[PDB]
Design a protein around this ligand. Sequence first.
Ligand SMILES: O=C1CCN(C2C[C@H](O)[C@@H](CO)O2)C(=O)N1
Ligand SMILES: O=C1CCN(C2C[C@H](O)[C@@H](CO)O2)C(=O)N1
Ligand SMILES: O=C1CCN(C2C[C@H](O)[C@@H](CO)O2)C(=O)N1
Ligand SMILES: O=C1CCN(C2C[C@H](O)[C@@H](CO)O2)C(=O)N1
Ligand SMILES: [Zn+2]
Ligand SMILES: [Zn+2]
Ligand SMILES: [Zn+2]
Ligand SMILES: [Zn+2]
Lengths: 130, 130, 130, 130
Amino acid sequence: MNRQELITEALKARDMAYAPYSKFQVGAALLTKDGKVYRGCNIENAAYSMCNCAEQTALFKAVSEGDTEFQMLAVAADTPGPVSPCGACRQVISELCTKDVIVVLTNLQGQIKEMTVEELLPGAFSSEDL
Amino acid sequence: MNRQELITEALKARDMAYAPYSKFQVGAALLTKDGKVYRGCNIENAAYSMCNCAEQTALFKAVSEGDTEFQMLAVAADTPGPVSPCGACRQVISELCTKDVIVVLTNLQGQIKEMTVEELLPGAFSSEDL
Amino acid sequence: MNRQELITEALKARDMAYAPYSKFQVGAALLTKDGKVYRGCNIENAAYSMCNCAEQTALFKAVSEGDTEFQMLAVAADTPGPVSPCGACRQVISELCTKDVIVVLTNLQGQIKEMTVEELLPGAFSSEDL
Amino acid sequence: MNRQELITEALKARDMAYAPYSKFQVGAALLTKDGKVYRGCNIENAAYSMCNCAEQTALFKAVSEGDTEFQMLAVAADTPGPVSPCGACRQVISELCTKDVIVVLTNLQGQIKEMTVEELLPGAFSSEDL
Ligand SMILES: O=C1CCN(C2C[C@H](O)[C@@H](CO)O2)C(=O)N1
Ligand SMILES: O=C1CCN(C2C[C@H](O)[C@@H](CO)O2)C(=O)N1
Ligand SMILES: O=C1CCN(C2C[C@H](O)[C@@H](CO)O2)C(=O)N1
Ligand SMILES: O=C1CCN(C2C[C@H](O)[C@@H](CO)O2)C(=O)N1
Ligand SMILES: [Zn+2]
Ligand SMILES: [Zn+2]
Ligand SMILES: [Zn+2]
Ligand SMILES: [Zn+2]
């Protein structure tokens, strides 16, 4: 399961998205240490604040299943450049993923940006601060 | 899959909860028309606003899998009376579940409150309002 | 400061709304025991989950100023019937407002629905449950 | 209104915080181009996902008043090092503040970290992506 394969997973996950308000579909694919893949997509709501992002859907699914050891996360959307996870998502990622987990960002035209969880949100607010 | 059985599902789902901040674990079990059960649990974050509830975890998992037809939702937590879904959850439920879906609320002592999605949040803000 | 006057406050507050994504402007006016009025409006974000509602804006402003004793809350939007506070808002209202506070809901055509905070979200999840 | 003076504003704002759940109070002070200061503090809820951060409180207050031109934002909390805005906050900041706005982070022991809005969340998901 290389990153190109994980990207295809995210691309398929994107088609399951429920985004009738923004018409902006996003897909994510989370790869565990054991090699299992969890797909995620954004799910919207008439009350915009309740919208859930693809990255969080994938992470929530994994964690709810008992999987907490990850190695890579791929995210895709039809944006100009590689899709940029929103701040809230980066925060969730920084909590549920270890600092060296690889985050692969891409769009629907082959643009690819790779970075670690640490780089995604340097010095992220954490439990240690509490 | 009667409600008592769906409640046991929620009780097991509760044990998967990631809630180190509140120490308040919640579990949810969503039953589809076809009879499939999706388990959910709350997942917290150092940044409290990023916490995700059990009900939403279950619904997000189902929807991401292509399942959008539900018949019942069970929720459980160690509260004095039947657990009360927070407002945000009721909003998500009102969007992803049809009005007559049955919502079963309970705690860890056999208290049970049953109501429909409509009753859970009467006249909920919806797409029609937009 | 009767309810009709508080409604006009909410109607003016609505014009300050920053909602370029939904194009759905909402206004709110919070009246304290001492008679002070706090205006609120929805403020959106490209990342939909970060959108903040009018009711919350008004309540956050008041509380940040040291005002925590309220008597009435008015909310207005261009909806078919009286605007319905989203679940997340009802949850915040239920925490920051005592159960006797009067909530006045209306649209831009004279439709008015009045109810207490308790009625807005009966048996709302609260600190007592934690 | 230099940064040291804006920091004192944030320190005072912090005392207004409503955070009975985390017992973690945060303060923020937003300075407009015209020199006006808006104070903010975190406001919690029994349902953790509804918690609002200091930075957002200050920004929401300003915007609701018609002020949309800012020059600096100060944030303070009792953390080991300068307080780190959570991802959700950085996202809101990136939307409501121009990229040149200065963000001043500090704790209660004189540690100070200064950076621009762009640096706070480089390549932040924005309307252009939609
Ligand atoms: O973090 C990324 C960027 C944002 N989108 C979302 C949520 C929402 O339904 C839509 C518009 O913000 O894209 C995601 O799903 N993931
Ligand atoms: O709607 C219900 C009530 C609230 N809890 C949550 C989220 C959070 O982790 C914790 C404290 O609010 O319980 C749920 O998970 N579901
Ligand atoms: O609770 C009410 C209903 C929802 N709207 C919002 C937030 C968002 O910007 C827009 C669409 O959901 O209306 C409010 O501002 N208040
Ligand atoms: O972005 C910063 C970091 C997080 N805190 C919050 C919200 C919540 O009440 C508490 C614990 O997450 O600190 C803030 O208020 N601002
Ligand atoms: Zn996101
Ligand atoms: Zn909830
Ligand atoms: Zn709302
Ligand atoms: Zn924050």
